[PDB]
Design a protein around this ligand. Structure first.
Ligand SMILES: Nc1nc2cnc(-c3ccccc3)cn2n1
Length: 251
């Protein structure tokens, strides 16, 4: 059956270093350019990664539509935002760098918002990092803790359930990668969050950023901010919102 212009020769790719294991390799495409190659275990409907192109989304390069199915994309030299924040770099990141990263992610998601798509698994383990603190939304391929209640309970995934996740992602950045709802197991999160619990302000995080988290965690998904609003807020943050910001111990 008929391929499209994304298709490339099964073996026009040189796999080298293995990076994960569902498996992910670094490689070289037509001997000239470095890529990442995610391999599946037994891309049919990648009509999602094909239609999106933006500077803050990991770019699709090519596919291979036969088992084992390949997906080739740009190489992100630092790997996942989660690993980056939990590794050696986490202790040196302060609020300006973390808010900047948040802004990049909102910029990719504001594009997703315009195109009328929905990510469904926005969390730091699905943001990829390159040099110069470039972050890019990845993996449009159970993370109850990151999912809006209406989506966890009733399968209502909208751009507004993504916003909710983006708010959890903001606690990931401000805590240098901690799992959210520390001490709570999945069921206790779901019950507590339905009764109105929200994570409190993380140590040394300014109130104005916690308020932003709180708005993304509104019960009525319609009262949650847009990513366009989020991007603009984050970009202008140290002039418009926290002009007197002082670095502290950890942020
Ligand atoms: N597109 C893409 N996908 C992945 C997955 N993992 C990495 C990576 C993982 C560890 C160290 C450096 C890079 C990098 N990329 N880049």
């Amino acid at each position: 059956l008929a391929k499209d212009a994304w298709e490339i020769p099964r073996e026009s790719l040189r796999l080298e270093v293995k990076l994960g294991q569902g498996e992910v390799w670094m490689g070289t495409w037509n001997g000239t350019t470095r890529v990442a190659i995610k391999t599946l275990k037994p891309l049919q409907e990648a009509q999602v990664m094909k239609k999106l192109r933006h500077e803050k989304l990991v770019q699709l390069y090519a596919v291979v539509s036969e088992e084992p199915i390949y997906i080739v994309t740009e190489y992100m030299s630092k790997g996942s935002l989660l690993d980056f924040l939990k590794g050696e770099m986490g202790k040196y990141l302060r609020l300006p760098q973390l808010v900047d990263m948040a802004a990049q992610i909102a910029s990719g998601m504001a594009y997703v918002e315009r195109m009328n798509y929905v990510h469904r698994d926005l969390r730091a383990a699905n943001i990829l990092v390159g040099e110069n603190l470039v972050c890019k939304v990845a993996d449009f391929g159970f993370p109850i803790k990151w999912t809006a209640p209406e989506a966890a309970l009733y399968g209502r995934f909208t751009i507004k359930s993504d916003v909710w996740s983006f708010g959890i992602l903001l606690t990931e950045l401000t805590t240098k990668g901690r799992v959210p709802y520390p001490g709570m197991v999945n069921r206790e999160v779901l019950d507590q969050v339905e009764r109105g619990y929200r994570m409190p302000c993380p140590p040394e995080c300014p109130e104005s950023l916690h308020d932003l988290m709180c708005q993304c965690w509104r019960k009525d998904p319609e009262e949650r901010p847009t990513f366009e609003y989020l991007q603009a807020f984050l970009e202008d943050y140290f002039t418009s919102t926290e002009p007197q910001y002082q670095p502290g111990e950890n942020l």
